Design a protein around this ligand. Structure first.
Ligand SMILES: [Ca+2]
Ligand SMILES: [Ca+2]
Ligand SMILES: [Ca+2]
Ligand SMILES: [Ca+2]
Ligand SMILES: [Ca+2]
Ligand SMILES: [Ca+2]
Lengths: 207, 207
């Protein structure tokens, strides 16, 4: 069973006028206006509106997918004069499509970790993980890549995991005892036009 | 019979990435990837493209409704390993939705008309008509209103028809013999943000 009864609406619309969703219609409609398409259900009448003669649906408000990604509504074509149904009260869904409008975010502004002095290069210090509220199942709007803004060449970060590792030998605890590392998490695969978030990792060398 | 098998695509897309059209899908799909959604028909494979695992369709080129407003394509869900159909080769349509991106246009840059001198106020001179290539069955993108930029108070134009009429008595042919009238045709009901076109009407008073 093909699943056609759904409309796809792009989120965060900013046009001057209302956003066009689609047109409900029955093949029985001859265009004489004797049919009255009514909209009912979640948001019907307010957020979403229908032109009861043609079936064209519009959205009156700017929709945010990260706040709600689906809307379930019901459609009914009726005989305008007798209120006798022509088609059955079919259920349809308005899928809110995603745009990259959420920057990667770490749970804490500052991490705290340690690593023994004189650790071999590539020793694991801490693994930072940023989240992205966009849709992972579509595009790179939520594919996060990690980079080190501050802390080189002493440290490195695995771009795909966020694992911070020591990158140099002979990191004397006597010489320097606390390093400060900044990590960037940029979405869109970490490429041009992607949104980014940062965090600070305070590291301490131990004995 | 509800008519669900159609997607609505806004014209003149200018986003950096491709434009999302929609997602073909069968309720028989369990998400295990054993299904391969194939797209075929008008523009398939080139202008429009499908993600054969999920069914997501995209448009690779900026589409112009005034150049083509509908695209007919066919969908098939198949068993990826045996090429055995799971669903029937259903036909669907991609409706190109309209934006107001065509200014009203007159057929000729300059009209030519006459009116007898000493004609009563409201005498008909000529009727100019501008066309609008946008969609009349949706919004005011093609509802044209006429206004007189030059030629007052000698002449007036009916906003809804384009009929230019004399507006003053005692228009001596001896005094002045050729008047020049400019008419504007602005869409969107002739209101803020509407597109406009102009023309010049050379008028001559006669005996
Ligand atoms: Ca959002
Ligand atoms: Ca993002
Ligand atoms: Ca988003
Ligand atoms: Ca166009
Ligand atoms: Ca127009
Ligand atoms: Ca247009």
């Amino acid at each position: 069973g093909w699943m056609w009864n759904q409309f796809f609406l792009l989120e965060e619309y900013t046009g001057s006028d209302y956003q066009y969703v689609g047109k409900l219609h029955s093949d029985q409609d001859k265009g004489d206006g004797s049919l009255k398409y009514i909209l009912s259900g979640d948001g019907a009448g307010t957020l979403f509106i229908i032109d009861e003669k043609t079936g064209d649906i519009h959205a009156t408000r700017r929709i945010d997918r990260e706040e709600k990604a689906f809307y379930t509504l019901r459609a009914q074509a009726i005989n305008r004069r007798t209120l006798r149904p022509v088609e059955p009260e079919s259920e349809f869904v308005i899928k809110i499509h995603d745009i990259n409008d959420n920057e990667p975010t770490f749970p804490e502004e500052i991490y705290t970790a340690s690593v023994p002095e004189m650790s071999v290069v590539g020793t694991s210090v801490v693994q930072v993980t940023a989240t992205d509220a966009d849709d992972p199942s579509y595009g790179n709007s939520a594919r996060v890549i990690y980079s080190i803004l501050q802390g080189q060449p002493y440290f490195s970060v695995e771009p795909e995991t966020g694992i911070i590792r020591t990158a140099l030998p002979n990191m004397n605890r006597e010489n320097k005892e606390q390093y400060q590392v900044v990590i960037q998490a940029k979405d869109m695969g970490g490429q041009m036009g992607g949104l980014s978030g940062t965090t600070t990792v305070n590291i301490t060398l131990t004995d």
